[PDB]
């Protein structure tokens, strides 16, 4: 009855572990273990949540533990203790195995392979805390317990890949506690959090684990951004090592999205634009991914107004993301029309929301782009145009001031005009017919090379999974 329910959950987990244990006894590998490990983690996340708070505890007790079973149980005491299903028949077993962590063998200590087992019991305690949706001291206790265990000995390739996924949860739970209710010791412990993450990346370099390296790089970028330590992250992004070989496509989505943030801050709007489109196309359409997409789209609108490119109105309408994106929709219309008065209203109306996402800093730089976009519209509309007419339209000062705006603005080439100060007009330089110039030559070359690069990626990838299947016995 009650023993049956905890026993069933345990038996699911055992088959998944046993599968990997067999695989790493032949020869440790990276990718074949992970696909199984990801499937197990889903089942554990769903069973911890839905089925009582003591179904983790049964497992933890059931296997041999250094001191983890007692640290697990502590967490459960606080939220109404459990004591049930820890008597023999939940502790008189070590759960079907052939002989490599089987009951008879382990107790006898003809072998002991707590190696794999310890890393999985860590995976449970992280999942279980985010399920509870709780933070306080329990976070601290999770931080303290697992980190030196993993640092008092080197890990095998399989075990390093379990412990990369624990680091993300440690980091996430620390950062949420600051956001629920800021504290003063959260600040000093953040230096500690900061130290371990970078030290980890060195540790993973020696084991030559591709998937372990990538996931830590994603963490360092995120950690700098919420601390706002962009200076240190600017040195980091020009000195990376990221592989895209074995990484999951969630990791790749995240990586590109982080770059777009730092770049936008450094006043690169052209590189930021390329990478934010990369991040979105990797990500799913699902409501699973919903919140990742909103922050991404907030940044994506912002980059375009920083360029002078001005997002589509369709883009808000085809998504059902309208209400989240409502403040960027009012900025889009404002910059396009040239109306500073419309713009100033938008940034006062929605100040609070923008400042939450910490995208308000990026938004104030847009008060400039109204003025510069306004001069580009006026140079399109009239080839030659008096200085005074600009002052009326955009609600600016003297003509001398307007002269200065254009002199600066054509250093980037935004207006693409030039001022005559003895003829008293502004004369734009565009009169297209660049197909009579040598320009398209340059362009076609680039598209051809872009095609060549997709061909190459096709070649290496097409045959590598083919090769696994043909080698593998299935006849």
């Amino acid at each position: 009855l009650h023993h049956s329910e905890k026993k069933y959950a345990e038996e699911d987990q055992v088959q998944e572990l046993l599968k990997v244990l067999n695989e790493i006894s032949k020869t440790t590998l990276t990718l074949d273990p992970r696909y199984i490990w990801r499937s197990l983690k889903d089942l554990s996340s769903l069973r911890n949540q839905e089925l009582l708070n003591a179904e983790t505890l049964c497992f933890t007790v059931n296997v041999l533990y250094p001191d983890s079973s007692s640290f697990k149980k502590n967490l459960l005491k606080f939220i109404t203790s459990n004591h049930k299903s820890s008597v023999p028949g939940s502790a008189e077993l070590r759960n079907s195995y052939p002989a490599s962590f089987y009951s008879v063998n382990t107790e006898k200590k003809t072998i002991e392979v707590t190696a794999e087992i310890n890393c999985f019991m860590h995976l449970l305690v992280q999942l279980f805390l985010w399920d509870s949706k709780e933070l306080e001291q329990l976070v601290e206790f999770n931080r303290k317990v697992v980190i030196p265990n993993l640092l008092c000995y080197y890990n095998l390739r399989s075990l390093n890949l379990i412990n990369a996924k624990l680091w993300f949860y440690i980091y996430l739970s620390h950062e949420t506690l600051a956001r629920s209710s800021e504290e003063i010791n959260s600040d000093n412990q953040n230096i500690i959090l900061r130290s371990t993450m970078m030290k980890f990346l060195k540790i993973a370099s020696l084991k030559h684990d591709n998937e372990t390296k990538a996931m830590l790089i994603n963490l360092i970028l995120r950690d700098f951004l919420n601390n706002g330590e962009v200076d240190s992250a600017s040195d980091f992004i020009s000195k990376l090592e990221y592989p895209h070989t074995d990484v999951s496509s969630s990791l790749e989505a995240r990586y590109f999205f982080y770059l777009s943030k730092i770049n936008a801050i450094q006043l690169d709007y052209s590189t930021a634009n390329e990478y934010i489109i990369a991040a979105i196309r990797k990500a799913p359409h699902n409501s699973k991914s919903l919140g990742f997409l909103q922050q991404s789209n907030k940044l994506h609108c912002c980059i375009q107004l920083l360029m002078g490119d001005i997002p589509e109105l369709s883009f808000f309408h085809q998504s059902n993301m309208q209400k989240s994106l409502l403040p960027y929709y009012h900025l889009t219309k404002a910059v396009k029309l040239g109306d500073l008065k419309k713009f100033t209203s938008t940034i006062t109306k929605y100040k609070q929301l923008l400042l939450k996402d910490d995208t308000y800093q990026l938004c104030v730089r847009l008060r400039s782009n109204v003025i510069k976009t306004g001069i580009r519209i006026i140079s399109l509309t009239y080839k030659k145009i008096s200085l005074r007419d600009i002052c009326l339209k955009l609600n600016l000062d003297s003509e001398q001031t307007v002269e200065y705006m254009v002199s600066r603005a054509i250093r980037d080439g935004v207006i693409e005009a030039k001022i005559n100060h003895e003829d008293g007009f502004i004369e734009t330089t565009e009169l297209l017919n660049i197909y009579d110039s040598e320009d398209p030559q340059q362009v076609f070359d680039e598209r051809i090379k872009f095609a060549n690069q997709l061909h190459d990626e096709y070649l290496v990838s097409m045959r590598y999974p083919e090769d696994k299947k043909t080698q593998q016995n299935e006849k």
């Binding site: 030290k199 990346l201 060195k202 540790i203 020696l206 240190s232 980091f236």
Partner: protein
């Protein structure tokens, strides 16, 4: 975190804070590796100047920085230049990384010079720290 307080100590003009800077940078060299790699030539100027007895310490920093960058080749050169303070990290549970690359490098050199004559144990192409 930021490496910025640490750079200022090297730049500060008193002898005493320049000695302490190398100690402070080296403690957290695995945390601030990408930061201090840009300004690794400042530390090379302190290696030249003969007013330090932490010349050996300054060289040691360089090794850890170049491993995290990606070039293992450069790290072992400057580990050998440091002389001692590299025999304490052969059994840690954290960093043995710089050491293991030395074992590799001697095998590469060993093949090349054996063919000329069996003796190569008195060549200056092989550093005495490397043999140890």
């Amino acid at each position: 975190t930021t490496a910025a307080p640490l750079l200022a100590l090297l730049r500060e003009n008193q002898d005493s804070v320049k000695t302490y800077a190398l100690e402070s940078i080296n403690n957290v060299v695995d945390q601030l590796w990408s930061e201090i790699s840009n300004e690794l030539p400042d530390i090379e100027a302190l290696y030249d100047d003969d007013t330090f007895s932490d010349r050996e310490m300054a060289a040691l920093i360089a090794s850890k920085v170049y491993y995290n960058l990606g070039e293992y080749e450069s790290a072992v050169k400057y580990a050998l230049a440091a002389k001692d303070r590299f025999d304490i990290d052969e059994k840690s549970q954290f960093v043995e990384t710089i050491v293991s690359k030395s074992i590799e490098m001697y095998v590469q050199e060993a093949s090349k010079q054996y063919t000329k004559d069996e003796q190569f144990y008195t060549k200056d192409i092989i550093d005495p720290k490397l043999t140890s």
